[PDB]
Every structure is written in C-alpha cells, then in structure tokens.
Amino acid sequence: TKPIVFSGAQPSGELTIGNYMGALRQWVNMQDDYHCIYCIVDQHAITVRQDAQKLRKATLDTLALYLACGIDPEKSTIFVQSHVPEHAQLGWALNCYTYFGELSRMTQFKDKSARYAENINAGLFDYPVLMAADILLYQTNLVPVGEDQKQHLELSRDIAQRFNALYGEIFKVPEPFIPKSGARVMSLLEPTKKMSKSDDNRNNVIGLLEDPKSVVKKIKRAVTDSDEPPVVRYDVQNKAGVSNLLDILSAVTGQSIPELEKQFEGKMYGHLKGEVADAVSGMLTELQERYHRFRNDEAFLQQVMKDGAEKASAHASRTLKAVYEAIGFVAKR
Amino acid sequence: KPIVFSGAQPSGELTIGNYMGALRQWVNMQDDYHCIYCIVDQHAITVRQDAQKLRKATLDTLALYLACGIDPEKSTIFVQSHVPEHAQLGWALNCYTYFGELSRMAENINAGLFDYPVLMAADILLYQTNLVPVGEDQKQHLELSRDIAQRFNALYGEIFKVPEPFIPKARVMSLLEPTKKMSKSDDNRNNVIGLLEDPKSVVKKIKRAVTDSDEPPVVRYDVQNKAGVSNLLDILSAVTGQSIPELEKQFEGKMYGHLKGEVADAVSGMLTELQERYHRFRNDEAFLQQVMKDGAEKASAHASRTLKAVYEAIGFVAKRH
Ligand SMILES: Nc1ncnc2c1ncn2[C@@H]1O[C@H](COP(=O)(O)OC(=O)[C@@H](N)Cc2c[nH]c3ccccc23)[C@@H](O)[C@H]1O
Ligand SMILES: Nc1ncnc2c1c(-c1ccc(Oc3ccccc3)cc1)nn2C1CCNCC1
Numbered sequence: 001t002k003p004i005v006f007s008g009a010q011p012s013g014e015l016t017i018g019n020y021m022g023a024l025r026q027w028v029n030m031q032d033d034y035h036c037i038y039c040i041v042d043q044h045a046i047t048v049r050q051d052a053q054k055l056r057k058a059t060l061d062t063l064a065l066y067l068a069c070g071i072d073p074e075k076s077t078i079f080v081q082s083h084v085p086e087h088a089q090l091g092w093a094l095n096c097y098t099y100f101g102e103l104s105r106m107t108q109f110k111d112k113s114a115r116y117a118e119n120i121n122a123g124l125f126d127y128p129v130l131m132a133a134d135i136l137l138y139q140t141n142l143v144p145v146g147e148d149q150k151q152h153l154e155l156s157r158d159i160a161q162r163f164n165a166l167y168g169e170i171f172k173v174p175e176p177f178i179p180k181s182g183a184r185v186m187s188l189l190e191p192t193k194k195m196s197k198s199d200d201n202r203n204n205v206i207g208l209l210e211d212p213k214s215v216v217k218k219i220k221r222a223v224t225d226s227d228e229p230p231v232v233r234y235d236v237q238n239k240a241g242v243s244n245l246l247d248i249l250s251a252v253t254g255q256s257i258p259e260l261e262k263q264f265e266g267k268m269y270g271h272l273k274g275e276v277a278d279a280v281s282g283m284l285t286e287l288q289e290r291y292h293r294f295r296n297d298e299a300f301l302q303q304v305m306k307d308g309a310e311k312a313s314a315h316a317s318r319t320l321k322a323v324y325e326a327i328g329f330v331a332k333r
Numbered sequence: 334k335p336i337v338f339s340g341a342q343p344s345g346e347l348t349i350g351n352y353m354g355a356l357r358q359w360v361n362m363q364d365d366y367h368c369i370y371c372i373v374d375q376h377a378i379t380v381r382q383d384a385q386k387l388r389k390a391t392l393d394t395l396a397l398y399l400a401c402g403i404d405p406e407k408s409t410i411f412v413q414s415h416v417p418e419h420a421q422l423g424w425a426l427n428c429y430t431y432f433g434e435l436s437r438m439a440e441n442i443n444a445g446l447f448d449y450p451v452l453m454a455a456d457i458l459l460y461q462t463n464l465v466p467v468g469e470d471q472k473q474h475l476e477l478s479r480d481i482a483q484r485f486n487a488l489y490g491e492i493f494k495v496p497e498p499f500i501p502k503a504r505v506m507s508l509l510e511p512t513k514k515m516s517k518s519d520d521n522r523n524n525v526i527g528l529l530e531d532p533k534s535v536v537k538k539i540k541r542a543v544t545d546s547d548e549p550p551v552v553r554y555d556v557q558n559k560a561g562v563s564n565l566l567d568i569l570s571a572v573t574g575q576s577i578p579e580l581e582k583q584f585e586g587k588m589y590g591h592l593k594g595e596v597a598d599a600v601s602g603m604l605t606e607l608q609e610r611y612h613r614f615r616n617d618e619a620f621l622q623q624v625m626k627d628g629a630e631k632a633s634a635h636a637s638r639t640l641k642a643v644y645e646a647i648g649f650v651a652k653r654h
C-alpha cells in the first residue's frame with residue numbers, strides 16, 4: 001500500500017493563486033506517487049458566518065476547481081467533509097486529548113477573532129481539533145499545506161503522539177509537505193500580508209476564477225520599491241513586492257529565482273510584471289476553460305461526491321472503530 | 334405527547350436517593366411522555382479514566398436502568414456514541430456558540446471540559462426535546478441550550494424546539510451529613526446506600542447514621558433540630574409509603590436502634606427485587622446488545638431528521654447515498 005496524502009480547502013471566499021501554489025499544485029503532482037485524499041472542508045468554513053446559498057454554491061465551485069486543477073477522481077479520493085460523520089465523531093474524542101492552552105495560542109484564532117469580533121465562536125476556537133480529526137482518520141503520512149497551516153499541523157502531530165502513547169499505534173504521525181516556492185504568496189498592494197481568499201480589497205488578490213484581463217491590470221499595479229536603479233532581485237526584507245512577483249513567476253514557470261534574476265539582469269519592473277502577467281493570464285485562461293466544463297456538469301459532480309464519500313467512509317470508519325475500542329466505548333452493533 | 338431527554342452518566346453507582354427521588358417516578362410516567370435515556374459515554378471522556386472500566390460502567394448503567402423499570406419498548410434507551418448525529422450537531426452548534434458563553438460557564442484543562450456544554454445542547458436539540466429533568470448544577474447548561482436553539486431559529490426558521498426544565502420534584506440525605514443530599518458522586522461512600530449493596534452493608538451504614546442526643550430518645554420529624562432522625566424517617570416513608578405521622582405513632586416509646594433496624598430491613602427489601610432483575614439483565618449479553626441496537630436505531634431515525642433540517646438551513650451540500 002502507498003503512503004497516504006490528505007489535505008483540505010474551505011468552500012468560503014474565492015481560492016487564489018496563493019491557495020494554488022501553497023497547496024493545490026502539490027496535490028495534483030502527488031496523485032501517482034502517493035494515495036491521495038482531498039477534502040472540501042465545509043464544516044471548517046462555517047467557523048466564519050456564511051450565507052446558506054453562497055456556502056452551497058462555493059462547495060460545488062471548490063469541487064469543480066479541484067477537478068480543473070487536475071485532481072483526477074480515478075486516482076484520488078475527493079469528498080465533502082460533512083458527508084463523513086466520522087470527522088465530527090473523532091473531533092469530539094480528540095477535544096478530550098487537546099489542551100485549552102494549545103488552542104488559545106493559535107495564530108489563526110487570534111487573527112480571525114480580531115477580524116470577526118462580533119462572531120468569536122467556539123468552532124473558531126476549536127478549529128484545530130476538527131482539522132487533527134480530518135488528518136488522523138485516514139492514517140495520513142503527508143499533509144501538503146501552505147506555511148500558514150504549519151502551527152495547526154504541529155498540533156495534529158502532538159495529538160497523535162499523545163493518544164498513541166496511551167493506547168498503542170492507533171494513528172500515524174503526519175508530516176507537513178510545504179513547497180520551497182509559493183508557500184506564502186503575499187498581497188499585491190501590501191506585500192507584508194499573506195494573500196487572503198476573503199480580502200475586502202480585491203486589488204490585493206489573484207483569484208483563480210477572476211477575469212484574466214482584470215488579473216493582468218492588478219499585476220501591473222502591484223507595489224515594488226524605490227530602488228534607483230530599479231533591480232530585479234529577491235530580498236523579502238527590502239524588496240517585498242518584487243520578491244513576491246519573482247516567487248509567483250518561479251512557481252508558475254518552474255524556473256529558479258537565480259535563473260529569473262539572471263534573465264532580468266539589465267531589465268526593470270516592466271519586464272518582470274510583463275512576464276508575471278503573461279504567465280498567470282495563460283495559466284488562468286486554461287484553468288477556467290476546464291473549470292466550466294466540470295462546474296456545469298452536475299451529474300459528474302454528484303458522482304464524484306458519492307464515490308469519494310464512499311471511499312473516505314471506508315478508511316475513516318476503520319480508524320474510528322479502533323479509537324472507540326481504545327478509549328473504552330461499547331462498540332456499536 | 335411531550336419528548337423528555339435525560340443524560341445518564343455511566344460513572345457513579347446510583348443510590349437509593351437517585352431511585353426513590355426521581356427514577357422510580359419517571360418509570361411510572363413512561364406512557365405520559367416520550368422518554369429518551371441517553372447513556373452519555375462521549376461526555377464521560379472529558380475526565381481521563383480506565384477504558385475497560387468505562388465500557389463496564391456503560392453496561393452497568395444500561396442494566397440498572399432496565400432493572401429499575403425503564404421499558405425499552407415504551408422509552409428509547411441507547412448509548413450516545415452509537416448515534417453519530419450527536420457529534421455532528423455538536424460541531425455545527427459550536428459555530429453558533431460564543432466563546433464568551435463557554436468561558437462564563439486553565440491552559441491545562443482539556444478542550445472537552447471547556448466544550449461539553451455544546452455537546453449537551455446537541456444531545457437535547459437533536460430530539461425536538463420539550464422537557465429536560467436537570468439538577469441544580471446543570472441549570473446554566475440548560476439555559477445555554479435554550480439560548481442556542483433560539484439564536485439558530487431566529488436565523489433559519491423553527492428548526493429546534495426550545496426545551497424547558499421539568500419543574501416538579503422523596504427527600505434522601507447523606508447518612509453522616511444529613512444537611513447534604515445523598516449523591517452518587519460522593520467520595521465518603523458511608524454517606525450513601527448504593528442500589529447494589531448487600532443487606533450486611535446496608536445494616537452497617539444505617540447503624541452509623543448520625544442521630545441526636547435527645548434524652549429520652551424521641552422518633553419525631555424535625556429537620557432543624559433532628560436532621561439525622563428526620564432523614565431516617567423520610568427514607569422509611571419513601572420505601573414503605575407510610576406517612577411521617579403514622580411512623581411517629583409507630584415508634585412512640587422506641588429508641589433510635591429500633592428505627593435504624595426497620596430502615597435497614599425496609600431498604601434491603603426494596604433493593605432485593607431491583608438486584609435480582611439487575612444481575613439477570615447485566616449477565617444477558619444478547620438482551621443488552623438487542624436493547625442497544627433497537628435504541629440506537631430509534632434514536633438515529635429521529636436524530637437524522639433534525640440533523641438534515643439543520644444541514645439544509647446552514648447550506649451544506651446534501652450527502653449522496
Ligand atoms: N497566500 C497563501 N500562500 C500559500 N498558501 C496559502 C495561502 N493562503 C492559503 N494557503 C494554503 O491554501 C490551503 C487552503 O487554505 P484554506 O484557508 O482553504 O484551508 C485551511 O486553512 C485549512 N485549515 C483547511 C483544512 C481543514 N482540515 C485540513 C486538514 C489538512 C489540511 C488542511 C485542512 C492551505 O494549505 C493553506 O495553507
Ligand atoms: N461532561 C462533563 N464533564 C465535566 N463536568 C461536567 C460534565 C457534565 C455533563 C455530562 C453529561 C451531560 O449529559 C446530559 C446531556 C443532555 C441532558 C442532560 C445531561 C451533561 C453535562 N456536567 N458537568 C458538571 C460538573 C460539575 N457540575 C457542573 C457541570
């Protein structure tokens with residue numbers, strides 16, 4: 001049996017080139033090498049208040065975007081989190097093996113709490129426990145995420161180790177898979193801030209489903225620096241915007257930063273932004289063409305969700321039965 | 334017919350205070366209400382305990398409720414962990430519960446100890462529950478369940494019933510501290526009589542029961558001045574159905590030794606029949622397995638209806654069977 005890959009994305013906001021380079025790109029590339037399981041985490045999405053029609057549409061948008069990126073339902077398991085009850089069941093059990101202080105110290109809870117002061121809910125606080133359940137159910141070996149999820153992944157490793165120390169080899173201890181390029185794509189007008197899929201200023205983001213003409217304009221207005229002469233060189237501290245543009249270009253083309261710096265010797269930010277705009281515009285045009293063919297095929301989306309929940313439930317039920325036996329529950333008949 | 338929900342915590346040996354004080358009366362109301370008894374093993378694990386002891390205590394609790402007269406054909410009795418909808422609704426309700434509400438109910442407590450009030454709200458709201466018999470320690474918890482139900486209903490429509498406490502209330506006090514209610518969660522086991530205690534144990538515990546220094550000894554009801562004698566009278570009245578004034582007449586010119594002898598005989602007479610049924614049920618694995626299977630099937634059919642309405646209101650894509 002192949003080692004197992006698991007990862008998820010929220011059907012909230014609009015997925016960006018950041019979500020693609022930090023996660024989805026690795027998801028597509030891992031499908032033959034490993035046994036891959038990819039989840040649309042609708043139960044995590046509702047830790048921020050959603051409109052019911054927007055959430056349902058966004059769940060199906062996210063599924064079609066996975067397929068458009070090249071996630072192949074003949075190679076990978078693709079499913080909607082709420083379709084597998086074992087996620088919530090194991091999540092409750094793992095609350096009892098997680099410390100309050102491990103949750104209160106989380107960067108995501110602190111940032112989200114500041115943004116949504118009127119909805120500091122228990123789900124937002126308990127977010128990392130459900131995510132540990134998502135990973136540990138599938139005997140997961142590798143979790144491809146961006147840098148912002150590292151703290152969450154480290155807690156899932158601590159929970160797995162703590163539970164195993166008491167009860168035996170119930171869980172695998174998962175490892176993060178974080179890319180060398182594109183692990184933390186930054187905002188186009190505030191390159192010290194991560195690119196957000198829920199930004200109130202749309203000019204900060206490159207949306208995967210945004211009009212490529214709109215995206216090219218945003219790239220040309222991306223902030224650079226006051227260097228005289230202008231020089232294309234990677235330096236996050238002193239050249240955050242130029243560095244972020246180089247990181248996006250490297251991630252799209254596969255070229256190294258040193259190769260890009262050599263290609264741009266004697267050139268300035270017009271050549272850099274021209275190449276980033278051309279590469280991103282081409283990628284999004286091809287991606288969106290595949291997207292509409294999947295998004296408007298409800299029979300195919302329905303079949304992928306049915307087959308994926310059936311495959312996930314088989315794995316998850318096996319792990320949950322072992323967890324329930326270990327902690328001392330009377331087994332269900 | 335109103336729906337009543339009770340959570341039976343597996344750990345802790347039920348006492349004569351639990352039986353004569355509430356369970357005995359609820360056994361006789363199984364035709365008046367749709368009663369649901371949930372053995373709450375998912376609540377249990379907020380406290381680290383031996384796994385084999387928790388499994389045994391779940392089956393001990395099931396067999397004792399059956400022995401006291403809960404009829405699995407009239408009432409729904411089941412193990413919480415056998416119905417996944419409890420955990421599913423609990424997560425959803427976390428997203429509609431303020432962190433501040435749980436704080437107002439440290440770095441080293443487990444998240445289950447912080448979050449169980451949300452699981453209790455899910456347990457109740459799943460079954461369109463009208464009535465919850467709560468202890469005084471659980472009144473704030475029931476108020477949170479009502480607050481969550483009203484908050485969700487105000488956003489999405491009348492998805493949940495707003496549950497009410499069961500207001501109406503036998504007095505059974507601690508044998509060595511007659512000002513404190515007899516409690517199944519007590520550390521001084523000499524303060525309680527468990528439902529499974531043998532006649533020799535019952536005699537020993539009643540004989541140490543605190544009385545007073547009245548001279549002559551007088552068997553009369555007076556909670557202020559004769560708390561221990563009053564408690565023995567209340568226990569004897571609750572077992573036999575004889576009135577306090579009738580018992581006062583019966584023990585005129587009698588000493589506290591006579592009262593204690595009659596209390597022990599009355600209590601052990603009541604427990605013998607409970608204990609026969611308990612050992613019969615507890616050692617019948619196929620009977621207990623069939624009760625749990627039937628109960629979880631009944632509970633899941635009702636719980637699935639509520640959870641589907643909750644998921645539709647939130648906007649989740651419906652599962653593909
Ligand atoms: N600007 C950025 N640059 C690079 N990568 C980025 C950027 N912004 C986001 N990411 C990554 O995108 C993935 C999905 O993000 P979500 O917010 O949907 O999704 C999240 O933040 C998860 N909690 C969802 C989840 C729930 N359960 C799981 C179990 C395993 C893995 C993931 C999950 C993530 O990998 C995230 O790191
Ligand atoms: N799980 C726990 N872990 C720690 N402390 C807890 C609890 C609970 C608890 C347990 C089970 C439960 O089941 C129901 C469900 C529905 C209806 C009725 C009962 C409800 C609550 N109560 N408390 C106490 C501690 C002292 N008194 C204050 C609260």
Ligand SMILES: O=c1[nH]c2cc(Cl)ccc2o1
Nearest residue numbers: 091092129130423424452
């Ligand atoms: O991760 C989690 N936390 C949870 C809390 C409740 Cl009440 C139920 C399921 C859960 O899963």
